[PDB]
């Protein structure tokens, strides 16, 4: 009968070990790709959205209507005085 | 009749699975890439605009 | 989903208002 080598069942216990563990670690790039990827259509989503705004002139409408109501305030605390 | 092997059916299985997941990750290279490509688009069109 | 709408001008603006009501407030208790 032959006499079984411990240290071998052990490295091939490993070895199943390590090649189960590569398919996580695929796993785990694939889903660090896919989140690189939704963050990059999130940011050209935020540049278009600029894009938007700056073509127009609602930039420069925020800022006269926070000019004008600056005025108005000063106009109303003269008025209540 | 043959006797078999369990640690080599389980090595087969894990070589297969991970032949499977090699095509995923391709896949998700492609989309980040075509990602990337949208920004840099956008990029070009607003310093389009500001020029 | 915020700079879509006027939510950061309205803060704004409420802020500028409360500083106007507290001028004025202000005003009325001197």
Same mark, same amino acid.
Request: negative net charge.
């Given at each position: 009968?032959?006499?079984?080598?411990?240290?071998?069942?052990?490295?091939?216990?490993?070895?199943?070990? /390590?090649?189960?563990?590569?398919? =996580?670690?695929?796993?785990?790039?694939?889903?660090?790709? $896919?989140?690189?990827?939704? %963050? +990059?259509?999130?940011?050209?989503?935020? /540049?278009?959205?600029?894009?938007? =705004?700056?073509?127009?002139?609602?930039?420069?409408?925020? $800022?006269?209507?926070?000019? %004008? +109501?600056?005025?108005?305030?000063?106009?109303?605390?003269?008025?209540?005085?």
């Amino acid at each position: 009968q032959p006499q079984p080598d411990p240290v071998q069942e052990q490295l091939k216990q490993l070895a199943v070990e /390590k090649a189960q563990l590569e398919n =996580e670690e695929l796993r785990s790039k694939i889903r660090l790709n $896919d989140a690189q990827a939704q %963050k +990059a259509m999130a940011e050209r989503d935020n /540049k278009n959205l600029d894009y938007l =705004e700056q073509e127009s002139g609602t930039k420069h409408a925020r $800022d006269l209507e926070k000019m %004008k +109501a600056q005025s108005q305030g000063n106009q109303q605390l003269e008025i209540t005085k």
